[PDB]
Amino acid sequence: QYPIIYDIRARPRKISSPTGSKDLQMVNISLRVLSRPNAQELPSMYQRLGLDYEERVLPSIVNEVLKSVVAKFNA
Amino acid sequence: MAQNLKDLAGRLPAGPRGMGTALKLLLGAGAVAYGVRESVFTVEGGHRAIFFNRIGGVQQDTILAEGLHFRIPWFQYPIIYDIRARPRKISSPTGSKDLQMVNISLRVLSRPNAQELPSMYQRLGLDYEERVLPSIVNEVLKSVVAKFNA
Amino acid sequence: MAAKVFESIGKFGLALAVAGGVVNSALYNVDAGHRAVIFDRFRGVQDIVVGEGTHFLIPWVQKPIIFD
């Protein structure tokens, strides 16, 4: 058995995403995203994400969601 | 240097009869072990190392999927196909249908078909990929891109 | 008698070291999320999906290529 050292320490990941808003003004919004790997699915999370799961999930879902929301409001 | 080996071989003690036959048997076993070790060839997976039959050339029918196949020493050469898909990014400038100068590159992901590899070696060789893709890529890029306006 | 014991123990130790080295060289670690592909050059790339798993790769024939 290998010790699977999940950083379930919430590793916040401040991530920027430039945006064309709803009316599409160039709005740049960053987002500090506070992720702990869910304990109740950690072993599947390691068959699924690994030890650097956070760099494997947040870096771009943050930008996904930033863009999706900010592109639904005028400047 | 030869005289030194002469003296070294001579100086071996004249032991009783047993150790002479023992040394002969040891040499026999050493040669046999060396032959057994050599009968297998350099083998990377992603390389269907087929039987190169000494007589008649490549074994056009012996298509070695993933599997032991012992090369008879001095009789079969390991044909190290890079059936590892070797992608080959290749550029081809184009006059499109309306003939705008469109330059399009193409990353082409070739594995030498296993089920025809021995014929592929009578036909393409080890660097088959540099022998097929480099310009069929440009062929097809040009043919297609020359069927659409800018 | 002692010298024969010394020589025999030395030969056994050398054989054990060689065997251990071969066994160590016969294993691979393709981390999960990387499903391995046997890099067998005897009969090729295994449609039998030998993915994650430290399957006993024979040396000189199967080098672990790590496919993510």
Curated annotation (Swiss-Prot), chain B:
Superkingdom, according to UniProt?
A: Eukaryota
Give GO terms for biological process: antiviral innate immune response; B cell activation; cell migration; estrogen receptor signaling pathway; mammary gland alveolus development; mammary gland branching involved in thelarche; mammary gland epithelial cell proliferation; mitochondrion organization
Region: LC3-interaction region; residue ranges are: 121-124
Q: Which residues carry this modification: N-acetylalanine?
A: A2
List where in the cell it is found.
Answer: Mitochondrion inner membrane; Cytoplasm; Nucleus; Cell membrane
Residues modified to Phosphotyrosine: Y128
How is the protein modified post-translationally, according to the record? Phosphorylated. Tyrosine phosphorylation is indirectly stimulated by IGFBP6.
Single GO molecular function: sphingolipid binding
Task: Provide the residue span(s) of the region labelled Necessary for transcriptional repression.
Answer: 19-49
**Induction details:** Expression increases approximately 3-fold upon entry into G1 phase compared to other phases of the cell cycle. Also induced following inhibition of mitochondrial protein synthesis by thiamphenicol.
Q: Which residues carry this modification: N6-acetyllysine?
A: K147
Instruction: State the UniProt keywords alphabetically.
Output: Acetylation, Cell membrane, Coiled coil, Cytoplasm, Host-virus interaction, Membrane, Mitochondrion, Mitochondrion inner membrane, Nucleus, Phosphoprotein, Receptor, Repressor, Transcription, Transcription regulation
CC annotations in GO? cell periphery; cell surface; cytoplasm; mitochondrial inner membrane; mitochondrial outer membrane; mitochondrial prohibitin complex; mitochondrion; nuclear matrix
In the UniProt record, the signal sequence range is none
Q: Which tissues express it?
A: Expressed in myoblasts.
Give the family per the record. Answer: Belongs to the prohibitin family.
Q: What is known of its domains?
A: LC3-interaction region (LIR) is required for interaction with MAP1LC3B/LC3-II and for Parkin-mediated mitophagy.
The record describes the protein's role as:
Protein with pleiotropic attributes mediated in a cell-compartment- and tissue-specific manner, which include the plasma membrane-associated cell signaling functions, mitochondrial chaperone, and transcriptional co-regulator of transcription factors and sex steroid hormones in the nucleus. In the mitochondria, together with PHB, forms large ring complexes (prohibitin complexes) in the inner mitochondrial membrane (IMM) and functions as a chaperone protein that stabilizes mitochondrial respiratory enzymes and maintains mitochondrial integrity in the IMM, which is required for mitochondrial morphogenesis, neuronal survival, and normal lifespan. The prohibitin complex, with DNAJC19, regulates cardiolipin remodeling and the protein turnover of OMA1 in a cardiolipin-binding manner. Also regulates cytochrome-c oxidase assembly (COX) and mitochondrial respiration.
What is the designated name of this protein?
Prohibitin-2
Q: Span within the entire protein?
A: 1 to 150 of 299
UniProtKB/Swiss-Prot annotation, chain C:
Report the induction information: Expression increases approximately 3-fold upon entry into G1 phase compared with other phases of the cell cycle. Also induced following inhibition of mitochondrial protein synthesis by thiamphenicol.
Modified-residue entries (N-acetylalanine), positions:
A2
Q: Which family does it belong to?
A: Belongs to the prohibitin family.
Q: Give GO terms: molecular function aspect only.
A: complement component C3a binding; complement component C3b binding; enzyme binding; histone deacetylase binding; protein heterodimerization activity; proteinase activated receptor binding; transcription corepressor activity
Query: What is the official name of this protein in its record?
Result: Prohibitin 1
Superkingdom in the source lineage: Eukaryota
Protein's gene: PHB1
Q: Which residues form the signal peptide?
A: none
Please tell me where this chain falls within the complete protein, as first and last residue plus total length: 1 to 68 of 272
Q: State its role.
A: Protein with pleiotropic attributes mediated in a cell-compartment- and tissue-specific manner, which include the plasma membrane-associated cell signaling functions, mitochondrial chaperone, and transcriptional co-regulator of transcription factors in the nucleus. Plays a role in adipose tissue and glucose homeostasis in a sex-specific manner. Contributes to pulmonary vascular remodeling by accelerating proliferation of pulmonary arterial smooth muscle cells. In the mitochondria, together with PHB2, forms large ring complexes (prohibitin complexes) in the inner mitochondrial membrane (IMM) and functions as a chaperone protein that stabilizes mitochondrial respiratory enzymes and maintains mitochondrial integrity in the IMM, which is required for mitochondrial morphogenesis, neuronal survival, and normal lifespan. The prohibitin complex, with DNAJC19, regulates cardiolipin remodeling and the protein turnover of OMA1 in a cardiolipin-binding manner. Regulates mitochondrial respiration activity playing a role in cellular aging.
Q: Which GO terms describe its biological process?
A: antiviral innate immune response; B cell activation; cellular response to interleukin-6; DNA biosynthetic process; epigenetic regulation of gene expression; mitochondrion organization; modulation by host of viral RNA genome replication; negative regulation of androgen receptor signaling pathway
Asked whether the UniProt record includes Nuclease among its keywords, one would answer no
